[PDB]
Amino acid sequence: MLRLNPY
Amino acid sequence: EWKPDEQGLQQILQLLKESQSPDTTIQRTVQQKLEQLNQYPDFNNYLIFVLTKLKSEDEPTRSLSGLILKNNVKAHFQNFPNGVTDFIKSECLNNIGDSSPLIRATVGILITTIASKGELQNWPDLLPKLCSLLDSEDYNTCEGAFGALQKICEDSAEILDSDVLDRPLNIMIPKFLQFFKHSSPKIRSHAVACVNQFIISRTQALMLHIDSFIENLFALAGDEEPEVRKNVCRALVMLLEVRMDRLLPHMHNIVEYMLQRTQDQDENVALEACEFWLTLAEQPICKDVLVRHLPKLIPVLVNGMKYSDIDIILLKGDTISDWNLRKCSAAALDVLANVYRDELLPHILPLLKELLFHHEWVVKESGILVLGAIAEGCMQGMIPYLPELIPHLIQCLSDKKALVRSITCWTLSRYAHWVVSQPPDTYLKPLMTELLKRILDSNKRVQEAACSAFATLEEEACTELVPYLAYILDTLVFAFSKYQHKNLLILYDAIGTLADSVGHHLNKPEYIQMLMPPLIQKWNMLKDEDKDLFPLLECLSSVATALQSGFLPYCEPVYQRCVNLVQKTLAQAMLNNAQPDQYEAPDKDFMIVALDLLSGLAEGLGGNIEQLVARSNILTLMYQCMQDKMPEVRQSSFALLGDLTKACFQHVKPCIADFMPILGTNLNPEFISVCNNATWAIGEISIQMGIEMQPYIPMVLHQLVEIINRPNTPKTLLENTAITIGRLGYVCPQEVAPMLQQFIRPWCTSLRNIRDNEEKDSAFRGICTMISVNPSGVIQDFIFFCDAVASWINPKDDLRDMFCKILHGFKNQVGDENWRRFSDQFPLPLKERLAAFYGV
């Protein structure tokens, strides 16, 4: 994961 | 038996009193005294005595003695005497059901620790003994045995499900199920927790008793105890994944049950209940059985997506759990949106319209999250509402609360594709302007969100970023001084993605002057074996491809570091191949990207990379990479080979004799990517070599003809094959000429669909030289050659003459009456093109 997700 | 010495015992009690000293400066002095006795055996024999036998001491004093013994097992059990352990294990099982709850817990943690550090096979009399303690008339003995059994089941699941202990699960599992109907709730919860450890593993002892399990689960459905509810929920979630068939007839009863448990008071029970929806949604029977519950399920999930009062404080000022009710509900809502698609809209749309425009930011934030979660699935259905929502969201980028700003970034990036399709002055421009603002936000989380969202927007915008390239670079470069840690890595992604989007537009003196100096600085300061090197490695790789010739003043430190990483990786590869246990396995990913970057420099800089190639062992390392067992490594090697062939073949030519046999054995169509680069490699080499290519031909020629004939072969592979074959026949036609009839059909079939570039030019130059030698093979299939020649729009004048001679040589061979009927099967553009451009 390189981009942050709210999940 | 064993009896302690009173005088030695008195000082041990002193050591226990000093360990309970409130002063922090005394606790460190006693630990050193205990550490010396810890190494001494027979000392642990004293501790177990104080815990159980010596009942004239304080409960915390006795418990501390048993807990110090525990830490000695966790470290020195590899040196524990067989005479001592036997007494400890015998003393624990005799006090496993102690009256004091503190003592019972200390004994309990000792038993499970011995079975954890020391293997279960070394204590074979433990399992059958504990099961016999379950049937004990004493309550505390029963609880102590179950409490220990559960921990054992949790620690060693795979061990119990093996032939190590002669299959002890075939007795325990049927025994556990009999305790689902026990009086005490702590015992009932213990029983379920034990069985749950063997659901996913499909344990034989449980799978054959699956009916007894499910029946006993439904019996505990209406249990008031939260801990019991939690394990029952966990049971059904696991069962849903392995035994769908046995749950299907009772599905509607379960769904209504789980729906009540998702709304449970205890968040721990709700979270475990929420997992049910997430697993059910990934089942091919969900759309039918859940459709009757969607109106009731949706508001439950949405309501659980709000931040709790406890979460808000932990965020202001990661610092939160990696998984909770919020993330779980959001995850479930996402997959559900992908299942029902637009059928989910009537249940969500009215909720959003109240959430998105709510006064309480916590409530509003949740709505924004919902809007982004259903983006992927309900995309085509949200379209009519986007002209209203998107401008509202852009306004929300400047909200007072940081948590509202960050989530808005993500939600906007979820609808990035639709924004790009619309006119850029309406949605794209204000979105991009406001995102760049949030990149320089004061709050660290918002910085991450905006930088991630902008990166996503870049992949969709592509060439639309050009008119904003000046502003974008200013924002990104300035972020270097603000961004640290996690914020810095995301920044590299934003920069690299930009380069892959604007392409050659980035190549400008004022742009390079701002972007490259801070990149080179970070490229030098970062040490090897760092987790910040890789994102920067991919970043520069994209920039080097974009800047092309503008990367020249900065290519020196980049080239050297890449060669070093390839060499270092191959070094650890050898150490791991010889002594695997002693030396760590290398990470090939660092080498593959490094090779790709080197391949990027060779193509982008061209002949200016010549000096760096000679001053390094890039070809030696490359020789080793081409022999690696990993396909991706061989792929990136052949690519680097072909690029250096065009860049500076004078440094490559010495190594041709050794490269060619490797390339000839890598022409395996099983690995499409590897085979393609290999085929393209020998083609480019064939050109630089010339007539000297003859001894290397027969070992690769038979390979290529095989590939171009095999059916179900990808388009790109057939092209590079045909191009290479033609390139071989251009410098050395004599060896390729007799094969002409064999590949003449797919060659023209494939190269008729490609543009008129240099690759096509050199290929057709070869097919003409070969026809001049062996005109026989082309006669039988001349209809394909004409279509291939007509594919040329603007061929070179010398190539045009070659086409003209072959065409006229064929017409003057068969006659005019045999040429008309031969051309009656030609399509309209084909016949007119040849009649005018070549005059045939």
Residue numbers in the entry:
A (entry chain B): 326 to 332
B (entry chain A): 4 to 320, 368 to 890
Quoted from the paper:
We have previously shown that the dedicated assembly chaperone Acl4 recognizes nascent RpL4, facilitates its nuclear import, and releases RpL4 on engaging RpL18 at the pre-ribosome. Moreover, Acl4 is required for the soluble expression of newly synthesized RpL4 and for the protection of RpL4 from the Tom1-dependent cellular degradation machinery. Whereas, unprotected RpL4 is targeted by the E3-ubiquitin ligase Tom1 for proteasome-dependent degradation, interactions with Acl4 and Kap104 sequester Tom1 ubiquitination sites in the RpL4 loop and extension. Thus, ribosome assembly chaperones can serve dual functions by facilitating nuclear import while simultaneously protecting unassembled ribosomal proteins from the cellular degradation machinery.
Moreover, we determined the 3.0-Å resolution crystal structure of the karyopherin transport factor Kap104 in complex with the eukaryote specific RpL4 extension. RpL4EXT harbours a canonical basic phenylalanine-tyrosine nuclear localization signal (PY-NLS) and alanine mutagenesis confirmed that all canonical elements of its consensus sequence are critical for the Kap104–RpL4EXT interaction. To explore whether RpL4EXT residues Lys310 and Lys340 are protected by Kap104 in a similar fashion, we determined the crystal structure of Kap104 in complex with RpL4EXT to 3.0 Å resolution. The Kap104·RpL4EXT structure revealed that the PY-NLS of RpL4EXT engages the concave surface of Kap104 in the same binding mode as previously established for other PY-NLS sequences. RpL4LOOP residue Lys56 along with RpL4EXT residues Lys310 and Lys340 were identified as Tom1 recognition sites, which were ubiquitinated in the absence of Acl4 and Kap104. Upon Kap104 binding to RpL4EXT and formation of a nuclear import complex both Tom1-modification sites of RpL4EXT are sequestered by the concave Kap104 surface, consistent with our previous protection results of an in vitro Tom1 ubiquitination assay. Our structural and biochemical analysis demonstrates that the RpL4 extension possesses overlapping binding sites for a second Acl4 copy and Kap104. Indeed, in a competition experiment Kap104 replaced the RpL4EXT-bound Acl4 copy to form an Acl4·RpL4·Kap104 complex. Kap104 replaces one Acl4 copy and shuttles Acl4·RpL4 across the nuclear envelope. Once in the nucleus, Kap104 releases RpL4EXT on RanGTP binding allowing the rebinding of a second Acl4 copy from the nuclear Acl4 pool.
